[PDB]
Design a protein around this ligand. Structure first.
Ligand code: NI
Ligand code: NI
Lengths: 158, 158
């Protein structure tokens, strides 16, 4: 099992970490959502799908920087919604093909009432999403740590 | 502060996520209302009511699946009606008792004019409702994310 990002980088068999940059709506009002859909950027596959089933969870989602201080949010994983930052490891998604399949994670972030001005700075760390992968064959239990960075400033009008 | 569901589960202190399975009227004609009353399903309480006031909002209500596609509606929160899907956080409801009390949320949904046949599929996600809880004591600010599923098909007759 391993993962890659679109025109990006890879995390090899056995896990590891990578940095992922996201484009954000440059202006978001209180009451609106910034939707950060990682399913178009992070893809994973099963290396032995004929004999082994891989199981993949969102182990944890954490907020950093301007997202931690200026937004409230939720994360959607494979059709289910959760608080972000997360409070538990999600149920598992099965990976059963060598064909790259999206990791179905999206953040829905909305400004808190105190946000104003530049609420997320370009280039800054905004989140960490930890993917945990196991299987039905051996003791493999690996973390794929995705450090999420903003491409651009996000302004909350005042 | 924590919450529970009818014959169900709990989301404990600090928030989290749960699934709520609801029985829906099996037949709703164009021109009739489908009512999804969560006040009979979701109940919450304040853990220190002698010294602390808990404040609870519907931060956001989102529609999915057949409700998103085939119905238009509003949401009623503690006696006032708002658009659904929602466009802003509601006013606060006070929780001031240790006894579990309803979360006073109901969806009032009516089929769109072109809807017919199976308009909501049994087992499908129909809504996500975010309960946001704060207090007048400390910095606690917690989300309770309710994933709402239909237990049965809803047919719009033709
Ligand atoms: Ni491979
Ligand atoms: Ni209690």
């Amino acid at each position: 099992f391993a993962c890659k990002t679109a025109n990006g980088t890879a995390i090899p068999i056995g896990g590891g970490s990578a940095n992922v940059y996201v484009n954000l709506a440059p202006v978001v009002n209180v009451g609106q959502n910034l939707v950060v859909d990682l399913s178009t950027q992070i893809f994973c596959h099963n290396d032995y799908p004929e004999t082994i089933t891989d199981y993949v969870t969102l182990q944890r989602g954490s907020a950093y920087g301007g997202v931690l201080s200026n937004f409230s949010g939720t994360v959607k994983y494979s059709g289910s919604s959760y608080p972000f930052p997360t409070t538990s490891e999600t149920p598992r998604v099965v990976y059963n093909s060598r064909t790259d399949k999206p990791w179905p994670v999206a953040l829905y972030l909305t400004p808190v009432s105190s946000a104003g001005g530049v609420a997320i700075k370009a280039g800054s760390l905004i989140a960490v999403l930890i993917l945990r992968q196991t299987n039905n064959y051996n003791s493999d239990d690996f973390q794929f740590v995705w450090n999420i960075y903003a491409n651009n400033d996000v302004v909350v009008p005042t």
